[PDB]
Write a protein that binds this ligand. Structure first.
Ligand SMILES: CCCCCCCCCCCCO[C@@H]1O[C@H](CO)[C@@H](O[C@H]2O[C@H](CO)[C@@H](O)[C@H](O)[C@H]2O)[C@H](O)[C@H]1O
Lengths: 48, 48
């Protein structure tokens, strides 16, 4: 996901948190990680 | 609920969203969490 110009803290709070909330309703997941950088890019890895 | 009227449905729905919903979706076996009542917070600009 992309949030241009937004600080990584804002990306993590306003983007990463609701996608994690939604993704939690998936089966056979082992753990989830979110990395949000100053490039405006959020990557969320869901490992099953 | 607020049995003494201290809080209305709006405050408590948003409190559930911000402090209850995510902590509940982390539980095992939960597919969906739904909130019924009132609405989301929103900046209302009531023009004259
Ligand atoms: C406490 C009531 C529990 C009823 C159990 C649900 C099973 C009933 C048959 C399936 C239909 C349920 O259908 C359900 O409708 C509600 C409205 O109430 C929708 O709810 C939607 O509108 C309500 C009203 O603004 C919002 O508060 C909510 O955030 C939004 O998702 C749900 O997204 C949907 O899941």
């Amino acid at each position: 996901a992309e949030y241009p110009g937004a600080n990584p803290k804002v990306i993590a709070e306003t983007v990463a948190t609701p996608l994690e909330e939604a993704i939690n309703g998936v089966e056979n997941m082992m753990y989830m990680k979110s990395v949000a950088g100053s490039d405006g890019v959020l990557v969320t890895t869901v490992t099953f | 609920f607020s049995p003494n009227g201290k809080y209305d449905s709006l405050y408590m729905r948003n409190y559930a969203t911000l402090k209850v919903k995510d902590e509940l979706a982390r539980l095992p076996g939960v597919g969906q969490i739904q909130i019924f009542g009132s609405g989301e917070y929103a900046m209302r600009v009531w023009l004259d």
